[PDB]
Coordinates of C-alpha atoms and ligand atoms in Angstrom, one line a residue:
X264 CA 0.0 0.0 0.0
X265 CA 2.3 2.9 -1.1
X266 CA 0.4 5.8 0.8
X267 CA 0.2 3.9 3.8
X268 CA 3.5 3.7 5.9
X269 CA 4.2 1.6 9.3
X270 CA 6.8 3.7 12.0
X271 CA 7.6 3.3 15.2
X272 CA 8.0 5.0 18.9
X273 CA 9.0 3.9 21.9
X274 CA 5.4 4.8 23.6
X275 CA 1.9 5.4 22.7
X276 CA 1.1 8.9 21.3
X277 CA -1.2 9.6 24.5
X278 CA -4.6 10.4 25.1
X279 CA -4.1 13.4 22.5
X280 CA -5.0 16.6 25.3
X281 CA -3.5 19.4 23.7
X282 CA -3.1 20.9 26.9
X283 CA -1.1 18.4 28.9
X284 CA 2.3 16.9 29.0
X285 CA 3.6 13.1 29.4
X286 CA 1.8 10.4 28.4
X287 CA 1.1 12.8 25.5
X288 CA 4.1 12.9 23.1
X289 CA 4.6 16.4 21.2
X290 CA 5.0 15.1 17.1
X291 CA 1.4 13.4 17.9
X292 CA -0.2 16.4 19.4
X293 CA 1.5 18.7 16.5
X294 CA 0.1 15.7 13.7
X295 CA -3.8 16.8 14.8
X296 CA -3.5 20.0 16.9
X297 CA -2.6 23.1 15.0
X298 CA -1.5 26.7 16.4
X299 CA -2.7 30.4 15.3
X300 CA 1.2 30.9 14.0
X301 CA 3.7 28.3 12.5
X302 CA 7.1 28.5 13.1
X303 CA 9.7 28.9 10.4
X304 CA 13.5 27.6 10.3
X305 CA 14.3 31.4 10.1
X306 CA 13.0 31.6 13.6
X307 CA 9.9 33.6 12.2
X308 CA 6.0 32.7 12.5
X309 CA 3.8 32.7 9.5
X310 CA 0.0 32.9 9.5
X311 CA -1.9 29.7 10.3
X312 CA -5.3 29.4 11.7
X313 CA -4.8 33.6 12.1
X314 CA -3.9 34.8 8.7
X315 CA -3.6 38.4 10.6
X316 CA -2.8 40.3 13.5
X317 CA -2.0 43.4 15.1
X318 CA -0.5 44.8 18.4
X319 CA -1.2 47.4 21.1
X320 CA 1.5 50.8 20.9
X321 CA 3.1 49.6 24.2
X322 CA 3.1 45.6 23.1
X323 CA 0.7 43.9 25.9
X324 CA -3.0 43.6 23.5
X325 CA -2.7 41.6 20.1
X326 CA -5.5 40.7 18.0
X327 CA -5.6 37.8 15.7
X328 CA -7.8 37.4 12.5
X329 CA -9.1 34.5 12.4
X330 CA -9.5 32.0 9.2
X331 CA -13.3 31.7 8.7
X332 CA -12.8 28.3 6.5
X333 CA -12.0 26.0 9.1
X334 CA -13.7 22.8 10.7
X335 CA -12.5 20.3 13.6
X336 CA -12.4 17.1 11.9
X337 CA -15.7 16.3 13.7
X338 CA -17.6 19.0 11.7
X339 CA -18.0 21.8 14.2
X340 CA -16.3 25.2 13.0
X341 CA -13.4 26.4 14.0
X342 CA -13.7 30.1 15.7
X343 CA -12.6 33.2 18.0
X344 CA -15.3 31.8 20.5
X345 CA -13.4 28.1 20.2
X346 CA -10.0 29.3 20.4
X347 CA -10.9 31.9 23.3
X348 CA -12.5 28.7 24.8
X349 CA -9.2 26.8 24.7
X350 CA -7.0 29.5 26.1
X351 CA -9.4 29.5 29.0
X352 CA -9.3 25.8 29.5
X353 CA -5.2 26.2 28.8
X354 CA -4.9 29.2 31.2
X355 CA -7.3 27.2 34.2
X356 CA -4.3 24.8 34.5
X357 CA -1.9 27.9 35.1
X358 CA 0.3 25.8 37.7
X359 CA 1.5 23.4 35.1
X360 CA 2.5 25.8 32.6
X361 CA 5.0 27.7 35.1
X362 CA 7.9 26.6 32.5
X363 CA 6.2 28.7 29.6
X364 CA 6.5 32.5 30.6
X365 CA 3.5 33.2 28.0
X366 CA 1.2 30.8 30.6
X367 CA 2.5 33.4 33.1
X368 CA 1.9 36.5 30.8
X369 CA -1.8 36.3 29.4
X370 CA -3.9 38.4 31.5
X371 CA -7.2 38.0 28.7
X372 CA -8.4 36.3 26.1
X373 CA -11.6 37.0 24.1
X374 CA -13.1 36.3 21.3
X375 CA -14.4 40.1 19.9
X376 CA -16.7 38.5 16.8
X377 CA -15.9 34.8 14.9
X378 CA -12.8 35.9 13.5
X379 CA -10.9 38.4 15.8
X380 CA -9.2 36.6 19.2
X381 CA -7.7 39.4 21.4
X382 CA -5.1 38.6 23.7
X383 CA -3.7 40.7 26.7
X384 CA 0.1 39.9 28.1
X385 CA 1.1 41.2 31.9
X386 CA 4.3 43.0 29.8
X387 CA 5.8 42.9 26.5
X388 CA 6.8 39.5 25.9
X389 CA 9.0 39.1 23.0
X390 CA 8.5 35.5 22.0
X391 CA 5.3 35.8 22.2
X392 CA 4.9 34.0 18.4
X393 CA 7.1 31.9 18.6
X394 CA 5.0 30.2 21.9
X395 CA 2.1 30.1 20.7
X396 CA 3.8 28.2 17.5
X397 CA 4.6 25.3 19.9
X398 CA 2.9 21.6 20.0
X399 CA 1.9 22.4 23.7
X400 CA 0.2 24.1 25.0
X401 CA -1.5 26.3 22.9
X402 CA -3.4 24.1 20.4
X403 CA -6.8 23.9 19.6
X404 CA -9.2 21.1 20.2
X405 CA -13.0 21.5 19.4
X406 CA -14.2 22.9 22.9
X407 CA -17.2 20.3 22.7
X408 CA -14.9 17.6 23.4
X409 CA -13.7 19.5 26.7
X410 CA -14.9 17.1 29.6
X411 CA -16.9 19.6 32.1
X412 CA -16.0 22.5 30.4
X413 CA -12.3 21.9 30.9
X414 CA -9.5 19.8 29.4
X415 CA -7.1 19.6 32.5
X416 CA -9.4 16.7 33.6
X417 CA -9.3 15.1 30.4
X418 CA -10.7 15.7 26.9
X419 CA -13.3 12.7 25.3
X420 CA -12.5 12.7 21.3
X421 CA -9.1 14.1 20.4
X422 CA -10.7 16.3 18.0
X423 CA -8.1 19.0 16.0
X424 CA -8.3 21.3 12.7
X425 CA -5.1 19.7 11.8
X426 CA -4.2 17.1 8.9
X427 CA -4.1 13.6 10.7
X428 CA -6.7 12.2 12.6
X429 CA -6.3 9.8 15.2
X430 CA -7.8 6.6 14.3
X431 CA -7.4 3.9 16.7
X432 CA -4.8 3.6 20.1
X433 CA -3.7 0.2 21.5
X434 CA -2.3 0.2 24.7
X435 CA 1.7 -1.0 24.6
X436 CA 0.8 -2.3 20.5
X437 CA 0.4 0.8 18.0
X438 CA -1.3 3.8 17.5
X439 CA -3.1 4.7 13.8
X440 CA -4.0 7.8 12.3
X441 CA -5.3 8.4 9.0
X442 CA -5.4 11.7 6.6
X443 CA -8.2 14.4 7.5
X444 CA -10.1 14.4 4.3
X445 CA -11.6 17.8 5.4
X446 CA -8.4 19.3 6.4
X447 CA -8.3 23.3 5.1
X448 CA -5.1 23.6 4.5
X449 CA -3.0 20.5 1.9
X450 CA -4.1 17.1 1.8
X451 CA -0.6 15.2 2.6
X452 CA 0.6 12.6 0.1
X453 CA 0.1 9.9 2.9
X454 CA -3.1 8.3 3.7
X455 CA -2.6 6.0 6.9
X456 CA 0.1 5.5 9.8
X457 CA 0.8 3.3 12.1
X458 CA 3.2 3.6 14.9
X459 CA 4.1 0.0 16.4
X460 CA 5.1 0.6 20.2
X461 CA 8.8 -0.8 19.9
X462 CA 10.7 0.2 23.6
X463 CA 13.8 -1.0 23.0
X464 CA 16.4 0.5 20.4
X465 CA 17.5 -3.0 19.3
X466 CA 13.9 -4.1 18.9
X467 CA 13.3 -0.9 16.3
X468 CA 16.5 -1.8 14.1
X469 CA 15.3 -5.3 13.8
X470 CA 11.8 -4.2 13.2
X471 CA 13.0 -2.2 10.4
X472 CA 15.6 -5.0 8.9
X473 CA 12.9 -7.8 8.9
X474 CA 10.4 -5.2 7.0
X475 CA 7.9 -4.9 10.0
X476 CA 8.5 -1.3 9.8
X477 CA 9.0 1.6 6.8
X478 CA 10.8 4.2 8.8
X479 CA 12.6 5.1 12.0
X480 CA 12.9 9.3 12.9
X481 CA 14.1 10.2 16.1
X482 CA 16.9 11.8 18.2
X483 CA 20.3 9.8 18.6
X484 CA 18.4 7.1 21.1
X485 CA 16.7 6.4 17.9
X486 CA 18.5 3.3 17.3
X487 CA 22.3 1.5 17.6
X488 CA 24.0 4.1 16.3
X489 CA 26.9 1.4 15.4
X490 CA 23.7 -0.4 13.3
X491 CA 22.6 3.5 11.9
X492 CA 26.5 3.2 10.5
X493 CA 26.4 -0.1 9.2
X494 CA 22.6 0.9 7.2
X495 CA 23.7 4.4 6.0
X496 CA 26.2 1.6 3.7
X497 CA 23.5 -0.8 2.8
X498 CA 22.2 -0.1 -0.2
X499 CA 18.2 -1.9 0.1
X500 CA 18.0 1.4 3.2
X501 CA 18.4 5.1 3.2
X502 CA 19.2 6.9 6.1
X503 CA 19.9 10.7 7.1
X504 CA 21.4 12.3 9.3
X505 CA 20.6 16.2 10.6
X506 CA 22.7 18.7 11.5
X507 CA 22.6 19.2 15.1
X508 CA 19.0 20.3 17.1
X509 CA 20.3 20.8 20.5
X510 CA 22.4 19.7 23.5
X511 CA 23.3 16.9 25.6
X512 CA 24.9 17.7 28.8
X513 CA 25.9 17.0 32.3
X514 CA 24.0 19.4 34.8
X515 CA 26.9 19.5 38.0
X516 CA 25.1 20.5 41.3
X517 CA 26.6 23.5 42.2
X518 CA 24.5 23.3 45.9
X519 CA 26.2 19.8 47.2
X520 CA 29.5 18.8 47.8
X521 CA 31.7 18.3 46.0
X522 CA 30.5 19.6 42.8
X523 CA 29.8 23.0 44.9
X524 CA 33.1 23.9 44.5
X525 CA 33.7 26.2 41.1
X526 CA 37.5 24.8 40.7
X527 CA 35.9 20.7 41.2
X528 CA 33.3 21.7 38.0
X529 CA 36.0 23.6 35.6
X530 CA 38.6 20.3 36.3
X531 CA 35.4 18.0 35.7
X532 CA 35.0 20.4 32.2
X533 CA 38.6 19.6 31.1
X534 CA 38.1 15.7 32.1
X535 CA 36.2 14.3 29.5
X536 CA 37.2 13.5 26.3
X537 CA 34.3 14.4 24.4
X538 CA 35.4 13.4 20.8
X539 CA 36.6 9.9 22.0
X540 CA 33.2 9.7 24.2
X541 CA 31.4 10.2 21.0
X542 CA 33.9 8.2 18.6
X543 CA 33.5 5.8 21.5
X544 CA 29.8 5.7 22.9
X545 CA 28.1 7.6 19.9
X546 CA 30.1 5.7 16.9
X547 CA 31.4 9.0 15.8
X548 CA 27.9 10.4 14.0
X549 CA 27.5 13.5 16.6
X550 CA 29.6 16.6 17.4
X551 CA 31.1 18.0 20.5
X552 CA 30.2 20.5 22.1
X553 CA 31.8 23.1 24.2
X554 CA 29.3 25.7 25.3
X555 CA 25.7 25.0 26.8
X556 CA 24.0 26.3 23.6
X557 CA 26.0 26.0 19.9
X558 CA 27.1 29.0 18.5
X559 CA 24.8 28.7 15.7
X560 CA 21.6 29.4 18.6
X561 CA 20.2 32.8 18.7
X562 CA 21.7 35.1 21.0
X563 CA 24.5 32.4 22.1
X564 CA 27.5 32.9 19.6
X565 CA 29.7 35.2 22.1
X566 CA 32.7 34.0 21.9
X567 CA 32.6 31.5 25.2
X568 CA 35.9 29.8 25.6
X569 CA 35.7 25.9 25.6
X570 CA 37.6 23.7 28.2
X571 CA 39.4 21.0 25.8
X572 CA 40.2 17.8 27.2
X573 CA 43.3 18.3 29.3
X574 CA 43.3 15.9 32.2
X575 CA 47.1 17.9 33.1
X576 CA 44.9 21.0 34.0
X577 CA 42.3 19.4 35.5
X578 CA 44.7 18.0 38.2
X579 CA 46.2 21.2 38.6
X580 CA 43.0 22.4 39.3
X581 CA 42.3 20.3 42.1
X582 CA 45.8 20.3 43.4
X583 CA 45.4 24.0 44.0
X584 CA 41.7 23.6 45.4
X585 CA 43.3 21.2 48.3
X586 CA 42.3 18.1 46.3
X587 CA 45.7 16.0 46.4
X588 CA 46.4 12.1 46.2
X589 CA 47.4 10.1 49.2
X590 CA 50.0 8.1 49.1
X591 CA 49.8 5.4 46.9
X592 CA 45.7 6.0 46.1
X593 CA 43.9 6.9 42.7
X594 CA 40.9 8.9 44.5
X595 CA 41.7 12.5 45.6
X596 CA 41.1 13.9 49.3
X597 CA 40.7 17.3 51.3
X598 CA 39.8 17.6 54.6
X599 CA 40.0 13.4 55.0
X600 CA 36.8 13.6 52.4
X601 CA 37.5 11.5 48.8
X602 CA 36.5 13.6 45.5
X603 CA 33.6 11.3 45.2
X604 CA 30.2 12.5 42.8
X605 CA 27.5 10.4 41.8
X606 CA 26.2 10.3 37.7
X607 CA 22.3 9.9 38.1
X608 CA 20.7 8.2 34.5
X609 CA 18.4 6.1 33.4
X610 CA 19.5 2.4 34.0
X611 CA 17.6 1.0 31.3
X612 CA 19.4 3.6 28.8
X613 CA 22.2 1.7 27.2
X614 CA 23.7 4.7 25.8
X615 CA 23.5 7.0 28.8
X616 CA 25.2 4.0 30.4
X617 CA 27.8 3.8 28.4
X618 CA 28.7 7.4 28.2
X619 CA 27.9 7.4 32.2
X620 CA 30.9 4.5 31.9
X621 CA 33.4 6.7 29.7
X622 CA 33.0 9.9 32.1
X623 CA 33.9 7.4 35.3
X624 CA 37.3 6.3 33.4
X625 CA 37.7 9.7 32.3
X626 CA 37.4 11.5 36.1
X627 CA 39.1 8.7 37.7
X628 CA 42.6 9.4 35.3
X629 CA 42.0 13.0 37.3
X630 CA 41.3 11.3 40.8
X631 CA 37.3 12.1 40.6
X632 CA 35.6 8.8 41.9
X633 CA 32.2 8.9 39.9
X634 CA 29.7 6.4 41.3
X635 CA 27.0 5.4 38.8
X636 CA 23.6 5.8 39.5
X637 CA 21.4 4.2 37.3
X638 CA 17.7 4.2 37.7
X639 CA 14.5 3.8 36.5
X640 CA 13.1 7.2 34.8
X641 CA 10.3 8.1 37.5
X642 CA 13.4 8.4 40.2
X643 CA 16.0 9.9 37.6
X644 CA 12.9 12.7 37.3
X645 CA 12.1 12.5 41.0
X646 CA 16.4 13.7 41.7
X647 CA 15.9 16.5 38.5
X648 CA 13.0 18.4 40.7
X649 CA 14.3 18.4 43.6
X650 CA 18.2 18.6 43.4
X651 CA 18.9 15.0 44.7
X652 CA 22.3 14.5 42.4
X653 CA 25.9 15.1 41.7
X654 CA 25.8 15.2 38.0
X655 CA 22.7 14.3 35.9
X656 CA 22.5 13.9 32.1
X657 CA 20.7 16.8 30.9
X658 CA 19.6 18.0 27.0
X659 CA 18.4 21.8 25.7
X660 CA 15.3 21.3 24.0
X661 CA 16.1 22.6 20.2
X662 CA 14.4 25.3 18.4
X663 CA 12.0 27.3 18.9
X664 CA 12.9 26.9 22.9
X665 CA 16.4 27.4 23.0
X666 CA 17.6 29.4 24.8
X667 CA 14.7 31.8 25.5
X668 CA 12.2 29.0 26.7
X669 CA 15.3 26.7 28.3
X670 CA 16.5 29.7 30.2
X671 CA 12.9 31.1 31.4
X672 CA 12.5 27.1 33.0
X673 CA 15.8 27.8 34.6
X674 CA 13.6 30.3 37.5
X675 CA 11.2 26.7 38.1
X676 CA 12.3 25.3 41.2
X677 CA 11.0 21.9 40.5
X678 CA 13.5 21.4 37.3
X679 CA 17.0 20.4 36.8
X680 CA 18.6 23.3 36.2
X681 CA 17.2 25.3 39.1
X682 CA 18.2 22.8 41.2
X683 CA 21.8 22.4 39.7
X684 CA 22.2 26.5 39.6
X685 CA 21.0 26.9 43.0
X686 CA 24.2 26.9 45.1
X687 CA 25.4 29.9 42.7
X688 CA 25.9 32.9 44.9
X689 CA 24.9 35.0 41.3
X690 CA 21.5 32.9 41.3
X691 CA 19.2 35.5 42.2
X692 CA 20.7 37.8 39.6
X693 CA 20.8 35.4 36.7
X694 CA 16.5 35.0 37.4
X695 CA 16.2 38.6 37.7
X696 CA 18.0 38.9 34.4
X697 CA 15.8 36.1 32.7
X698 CA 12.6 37.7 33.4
X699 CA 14.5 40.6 32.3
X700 CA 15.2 39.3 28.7
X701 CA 11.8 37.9 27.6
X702 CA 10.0 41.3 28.5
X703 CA 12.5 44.0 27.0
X704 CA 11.4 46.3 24.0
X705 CA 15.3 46.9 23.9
X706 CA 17.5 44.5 21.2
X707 CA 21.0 45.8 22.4
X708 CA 19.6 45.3 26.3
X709 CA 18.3 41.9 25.4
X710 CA 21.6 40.7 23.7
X711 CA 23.1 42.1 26.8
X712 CA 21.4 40.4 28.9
X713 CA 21.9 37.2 26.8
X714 CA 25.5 37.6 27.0
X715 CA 25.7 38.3 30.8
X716 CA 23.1 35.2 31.8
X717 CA 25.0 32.5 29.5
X718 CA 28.2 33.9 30.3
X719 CA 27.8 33.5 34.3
X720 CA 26.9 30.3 33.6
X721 CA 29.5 29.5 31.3
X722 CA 32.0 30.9 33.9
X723 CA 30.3 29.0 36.7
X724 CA 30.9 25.3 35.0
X725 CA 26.8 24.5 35.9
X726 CA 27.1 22.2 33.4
X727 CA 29.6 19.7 31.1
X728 CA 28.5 20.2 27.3
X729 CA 29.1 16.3 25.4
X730 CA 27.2 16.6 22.1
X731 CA 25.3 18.7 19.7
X732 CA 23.1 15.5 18.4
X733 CA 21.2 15.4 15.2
X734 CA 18.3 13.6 14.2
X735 CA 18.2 11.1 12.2
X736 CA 16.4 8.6 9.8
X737 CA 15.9 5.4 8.6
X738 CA 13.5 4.4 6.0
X739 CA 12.6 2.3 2.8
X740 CA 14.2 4.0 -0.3
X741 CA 10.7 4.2 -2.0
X742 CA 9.5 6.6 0.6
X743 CA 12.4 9.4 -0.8
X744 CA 13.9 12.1 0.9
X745 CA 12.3 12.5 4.5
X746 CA 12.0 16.3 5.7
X747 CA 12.7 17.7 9.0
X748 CA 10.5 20.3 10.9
X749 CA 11.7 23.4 12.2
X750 CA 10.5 22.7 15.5
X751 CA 12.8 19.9 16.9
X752 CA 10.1 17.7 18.7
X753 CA 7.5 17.3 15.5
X754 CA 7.7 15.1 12.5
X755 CA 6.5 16.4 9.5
X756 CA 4.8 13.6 8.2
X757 CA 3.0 15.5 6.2
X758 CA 5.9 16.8 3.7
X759 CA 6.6 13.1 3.1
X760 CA 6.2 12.5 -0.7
X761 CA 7.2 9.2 -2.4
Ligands
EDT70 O1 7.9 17.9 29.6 C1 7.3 18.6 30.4 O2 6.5 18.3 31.3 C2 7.5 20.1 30.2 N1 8.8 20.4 29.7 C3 8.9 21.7 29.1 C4 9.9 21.7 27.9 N2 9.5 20.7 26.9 C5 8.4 21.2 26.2 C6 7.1 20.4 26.5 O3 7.1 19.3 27.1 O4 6.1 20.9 26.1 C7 10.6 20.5 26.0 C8 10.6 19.1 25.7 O5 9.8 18.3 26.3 O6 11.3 18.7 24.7 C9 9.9 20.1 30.7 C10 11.0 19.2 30.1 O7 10.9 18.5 29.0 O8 12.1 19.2 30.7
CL71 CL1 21.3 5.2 20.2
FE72 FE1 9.0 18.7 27.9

């Protein structure tokens, strides 16, 4: 059937609320949920359910114009009253939005007729497109399939504007959605899909080499990237490989000993050998990095300078911080106390494993005794929140989030990088400047401010970049050339074309 194709994903989809988090995954939510504004690889918005709007003198009122030719796939029409309707429901479940400054912002929402949706920010918020662009939370599902006039309860029918429908969900087997024949926008080229649940990365390579499976899209967990090597030779598959969406890192807490000590975190930054951990661990197909976001970011090329392997600095280092080797011993001590940190990961994650197994070796040729802490995801999650770790792997979350969105989370107590920066005596400051950022009218002020917030933490060693990953693909050569979306967590499955 050559408009039908068969994927897979580590999970179910989710229930499909457009206004909630995990179980939902984002590329789902994106595939039948659509935003007023699209984002564009240029880091722009274009029109999208509004083709218009225009903004208050002093920035805080915007008014969209509505399309008037669009449905839900159910038949019911698609409206300022609708959308107002789901900002409302959005906005009701405030609390768990406290990442997104724009959940934080939006003081009103109303629909002024059926095609103008007026919206009120606190201040001037500067992304304020790019946002709403996102897969979550600002997406509209058709209000009569709210359950008791909300959606933070649950929703019944996963009812979008957008150009895939939701078919059928199987618990732990597959999820199927089909092409909306009503969709206003273009029909894509692809009629059916069907995501087979496949957990392991193993499992999803041999799905793919026995034929059970068309194509494989996903981040560098996607599959054995030793196996993504061997198939990017083998001519019956075609694979790709992106350039890079964002970073992987090691978040250092700089609020528990001994990783609260700036000279421990700049030695552990000149440790690791982050091209033979990739040429080792990642089979050479990503790229080190050096700074928390890649120069190529917005806002972030300024010059940082990287700490390159040099395990000869790194002792010095520690030598001059009253870290020094007892006789005849491999672990360093001050004070009687061994340098010992624990890595916190995912146990089941083979390649954070590995990598957590690299940077051990690595830190103990510096005297660092790493213990390896690997757990299942619901405790790795559990130590993120609520600062319970030495080191932690850590990512960035790509375009359009990075860094605007990735630093605004930084304020949320309950995540990682809160909890990581919150021994920093410049802490208060660096939140202070945050909020700053996203609400200044003033470019040179917010590149200032940019500069100042990623510098401090550059300065600070908060974190040990490893990678700028890439997505990357697997499929049948009869599907062709497989896009990629601007926005790093959504497939465009619609763009495919055989
Ligand atoms: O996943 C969440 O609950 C909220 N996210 C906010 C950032 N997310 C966006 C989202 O989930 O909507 C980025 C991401 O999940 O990639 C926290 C996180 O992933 O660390
Ligand atoms: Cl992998
Ligand atoms: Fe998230």
């Amino acid at each position: 059937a050559p408009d039908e194709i068969t994927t897979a994903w580590p999970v179910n989809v989710g229930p499909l609320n457009p206004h909630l988090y995990t179980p939902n995954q984002m590329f789902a939510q994106s595939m039948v949920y659509e935003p007023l504004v699209k984002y564009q690889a240029d880091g722009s918005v274009i029109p999208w359910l509004a083709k218009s709007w225009t903004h208050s003198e002093d920035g805080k009122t915007w008014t969209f114009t509505l399309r008037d030719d669009v449905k839900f796939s159910n038949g019911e029409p698609f409206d300022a009253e609708a959308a107002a309707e789901n900002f409302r429901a959005v906005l009701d479940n405030r609390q768990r939005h406290a990442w997104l400054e724009l959940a934080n912002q939006i003081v009103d929402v109303k629909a002024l007729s059926k095609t103008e949706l007026q919206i009120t920010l606190k201040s001037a918020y500067y992304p304020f497109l790019q946002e709403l662009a996102l897969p979550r939370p600002f997406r509209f599902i058709a209000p009569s399939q709210f359950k008791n006039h909300e959606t933070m309860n649950g929703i019944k029918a996963p009812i979008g504007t957008g150009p895939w429908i939701l078919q059928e969900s199987k618990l732990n087997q597959y999820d199927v959605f089909v092409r909306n024949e009503n969709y206003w926008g273009e029909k894509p080229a692809i009629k059916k899909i069907t995501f087979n649940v496949i957990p392991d990365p193993t499992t999803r390579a041999v799905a793919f080499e026995t034929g059970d499976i068309d194509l494989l899209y996903g981040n560098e967990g996607l599959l054995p990237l030793d196996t993504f090597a061997r198939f990017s030779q083998n001519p019956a598959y075609h694979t790709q490989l992106s350039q890079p969406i964002e970073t992987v890192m090691l978040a250092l807490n700089t609020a528990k000993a001994p990783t609260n000590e700036l000279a421990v975190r700049e030695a552990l930054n000149y440790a690791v050998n982050k091209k033979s951990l990739i040429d080792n661990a990642l089979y050479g197909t990503q790229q080190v990095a050096d700074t928390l976001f890649a120069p190529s970011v917005p806002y972030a090329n300024l010059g940082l300078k990287p700490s390159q392997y040099d395990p000869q600095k790194a002792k010095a280092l520690l030598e001059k911080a009253g870290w020094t080797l007892p006789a005849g011993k491999d672990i360093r001590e001050k004070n009687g106390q061994p340098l010992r940190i624990e890595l916190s990961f995912i146990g089941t994650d083979a390649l954070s494993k590995s990598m957590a197994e690299i940077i051990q070796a690595d830190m103990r040729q510096i005297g660092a005794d790493v213990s390896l802490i690997g757990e299942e995801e619901s405790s790795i999650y559990a130590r993120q929140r609520d600062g319970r770790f030495g080191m932690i792997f850590h990512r960035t979350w790509g375009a359009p989030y990075d860094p605007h969105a990735f630093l605004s989370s930084m304020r949320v107590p309950s995540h990682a990088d809160f909890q990581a920066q919150q021994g920093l005596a410049d802490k208060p400051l660096i939140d202070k400047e945050i909020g700053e950022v996203l609400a200044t009218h003033d470019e040179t002020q917010r590149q200032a401010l940019y500069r100042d917030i990623l510098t401090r933490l550059h300065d600070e060693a908060v974190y040990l970049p490893i990678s700028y990953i890439s997505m990357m693909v697997v499929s049948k050569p009869e599907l062709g050339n497989i896009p990629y979306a601007p926005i790093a967590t959504e497939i465009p499955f619609e763009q495919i074309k055989p």
